[PDB]
């Protein structure tokens, strides 16, 4: 009498096989221990469902028309102000937000399809906060502002910064307080190839590639400072980034 549909974000909805006299389908969904119910124009699992937690919190689940997006929202008991919101997008990334007493976002966790994460905590009304990127094998720590996320690794006199612009573009910069032209590191960012080239005393030393799989590779140049040698190695721990900056 009804069709079961699996939903992005580990949920499931039951849909009536045929519509009522208003043309609408009934929906019942299970979300952890909670039962939600609602209606829809389609028979495919899309629609809007509501329920109440044992503590009187209102819950709403919205499923996009194409079943590609789900939004799970938790509100205060009068349903007026958000407490939490989780969205799973069609690219299988996820965004989880918490809201403070006045219902402003105070935390946002973005989980990429590969499981790497951007964690923003202590978010203030100007969109500043603490930031952390969780990669495979290591974590990069830094700050958030409404202009950019800045993740930082330090080694000796060298500071490496991974900046993620507000629109999501990446740029990497290298600062070095070393004043000796023979050993001081400088670096050039090639936005086209996602590659940071480090130079010491007018010779290239290493390429750091920031890949679209959210990994970092390092490859050394020959003694000539002009040709790459060997093959790039994938960073698996923060110590290897620090070693690259020596």
Swiss-Prot record:
Subcellular location: Cell outer membrane; Cell surface
Entry's transmembrane regions: none
Outcome (variant: residue 122 to E): In strain: PBre and 42373NY3
Source organism phylogeny: Bacteria, Pseudomonadati, Spirochaetota, Spirochaetia, Spirochaetales
Family membership: Belongs to the OspA lipoprotein family.
Protein name: Outer surface protein A
Alphabetically ordered keywords of this record: Cell outer membrane, Lipoprotein, Membrane, Palmitate, Plasmid, Signal
Organism: Borreliella burgdorferi (strain ATCC 35210 / DSM 4680 / CIP 102532 / B31) (Borrelia burgdorferi)
Topology class, membrane: Lipid-anchor
GO annotation, cellular component aspect: cell outer membrane; cell surface; membrane
Free-text function comment from the UniProt entry: Induces host (human and mouse) cytokine release by monocyte cell lines via TLR2 and CD14; nonlipidated protein does not stimulate host cells.
UniProt cross-references to InterPro entries, sorted A to Z: OM_lipoprot_Borrelia (IPR001809), OM_lipoprot_dom_sf (IPR023322)
Pfam families, A to Z: Lipoprotein_1
Coiled-coil residue windows: none
